[PDB]
Design a protein around this ligand. Structure first.
Ligand SMILES: O=C(O)c1ccccc1NC(=O)N1CCc2ccccc21
Length: 133
């Protein structure tokens, strides 16, 4: 029952500073522009200890499956090859991605009926708000 309140199908309803976040991460112009138009569907499910997060969009579909606290390979939607670890900290899913000596942290939180995603790369934060589909 660890992630019960995250489970479901979620649709993006607002974005702030995502282009700047993607710039800070190193995403190039064309990918930023196309990816920035997308309104992804995030689908979160749990089977035993395995959490799966899918994101479906016109641009790219991604899927990760993981166990909390256990590092894994992830190829991001912008084609970074990263090492990821996702933990639960006080009810927040905290996802750290490491690549090329860099790091970014993505936090996913339930707040009212929303799922709020905060992405941080050095001093840049972007907020992506999802509601139930
Ligand atoms: O988008 C987000 O809120 C998001 C937030 C945190 C981490 C990953 C994210 N996004 C993501 O994994 N994808 C996959 C497919 C796709 C298309 C266009 C823009 C983004 C995405």
């Amino acid at each position: 029952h660890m992630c019960d309140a995250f489970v479901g199908t979620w649709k993006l309803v607002s974005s702030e500073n995502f282009d700047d976040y993607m710039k800070e991460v190193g995403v190039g112009f064309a990918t930023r522009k196309v990816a920035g138009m997308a309104k992804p569907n995030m689908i979160i499910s749990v089977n035993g200890d395995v959490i799966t997060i899918k994101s479906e969009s016109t641009f790219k579909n991604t899927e990760i499956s993981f166990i909390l606290g256990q590092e894994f390979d992830e190829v991001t939607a912008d084609d970074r090859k990263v090492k990821s670890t996702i933990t639960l900290d006080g009810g927040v899913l905290v996802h750290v991605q490491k690549w090329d000596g860099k790091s970014t942290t993505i936090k996913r939180k339930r707040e009212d009926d929303k799922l709020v995603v905060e992405c941080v790369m050095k001093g840049v934060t972007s907020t992506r708000v999802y509601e139930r589909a």
